[PDB]
Amino acid sequence: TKVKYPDGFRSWYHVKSMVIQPGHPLENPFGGIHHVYANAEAIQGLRGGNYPDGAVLVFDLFDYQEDNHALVEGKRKLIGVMERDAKRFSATGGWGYEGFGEGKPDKRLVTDGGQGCFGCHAAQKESQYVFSRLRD
Amino acid sequence: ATKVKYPDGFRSWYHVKSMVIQPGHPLENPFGGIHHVYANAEAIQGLRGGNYPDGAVLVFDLFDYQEDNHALVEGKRKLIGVMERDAKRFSATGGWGYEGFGEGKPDKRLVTDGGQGCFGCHAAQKESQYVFSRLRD
Ligand code: HEC
Ligand code: HEC
Ligand SMILES: [Zn+2]
């Protein structure tokens, strides 16, 4: 029913990164530099298999500071989490969605059972609701 | 110096940090783009405040980016820079060997001077064993 905090996510495989700057549609509240991490089970789905139960993707979001035309990572704003479990999270397409303010376990952000996150991710139905693609 | 080994499988290693260097910045040429730093297990012992065992490898992975409606999106890989720790083998440049691979390709080795040019800049970080990156949370 609740998404588990993903302890140890920082040592998982770095899928990709992206910078969202002011003015982008997703600025609020996804503005900043973000990195996507996948555990072993999520890698299987990214590589083209089905996502097994227990797959986890993390969206790791940092503020940045612009300093002499370099963007430098500042403080972590939040993490977004998707946890695969076809049965428990069937209401939201088999993924449970949670946000943790500042990446801390006790700061849960989602208040609508994940429906809001799910409504945008539904656009990626064809890729099992995941936007990120593996690059080399 | 012997050759620095191409770091096979580095994409699976621990992601240390990232930074974006944009036009105007002093390092735009040649380090412009979005870069990511990776470290293998031995390098982590060194980054943690331990000492660096021989066999520690750090990788700087550099991508061009594109601007897309107030997002910077990663484009093509321009190169990877590699530091491979071997105190005796690479003593001429501080115990680390330095190599670049154009577009990340094993056959596109870039360094022609034994790593002296790369070392000239990293020597500023003598105090941290020639490594600029710091571990974060
Ligand atoms: C559209 C309006 C979105 C909403 C609302 C949410 N997310 Fe999403 N998310 C979106 C995009 C475009 C992306 C891809 C970013 C990229 O670098 O390409 C993401 C990514 C994630 C991920 C990473 C896995 C993936 O699908 O690519 C996670 C773990 C994730 N998002 C979680 C998440 C949660 C918990 C949300 C509600 C609190 C949520 N997202 C909303 C677009 C949108
Ligand atoms: C100054 C003019 C530099 C020269 C020349 C080279 N590098 Fe360097 N390097 C420099 C900086 C400021 C940084 C830090 C980037 C960051 O995000 O903080 C780096 C980093 C690396 C790394 C990563 C490990 C570390 O020291 O932080 C590697 C593996 C690396 N650089 C390799 C490398 C090689 C192979 C070079 C010559 C081909 C080289 N660097 C030159 C600054 C400068
Ligand atoms: Zn605009």
Residue numbers in the entry:
A (entry chain B): 3 to 138
B (entry chain A): 2 to 138
Verbatim from the authors:
The first laser-initiated data collections used a delay time (1.44 s) much longer than the predicted NO release (microseconds; Section 2.1) and binding times [<1 ms;], for simple verification of NO release from our cage and successful binding to form a stable end-state complex. To establish suitable parameters for effective release of the photocage without the use of excessive laser power that could cause sample heating or multi-photon excitation effects, we conducted a laser power titration using the same fixed time delay of 1.44 s between laser and X-rays. Three SSX datasets were collected at different laser powers under otherwise identical conditions, at 9.5, 0.95 and 0.19 µJ (approximately 5, 0.5, 0.1 nJ µm−2), to resolutions of 2.00, 1.80 and 1.75 Å, respectively. These datasets yield similar protein structures, with full NO occupancy displayed in all of them, as shown in Fig. 5(c)–5(f). The binding of NO in the different structures exhibits a similar Fe—N bond length, and some variation in the Fe—N—O bond angle, but the direction in which the bent NO is oriented is not correlated with laser power. Instead, this is relatively poorly determined due to the difficulty of fitting the small diatomic ligand into the electron density. In McCP-β, we were able to show that the photocage successfully generated the initial distal six-coordinate species that is an end state in this protein but a transient intermediate in other cytochromes c′.
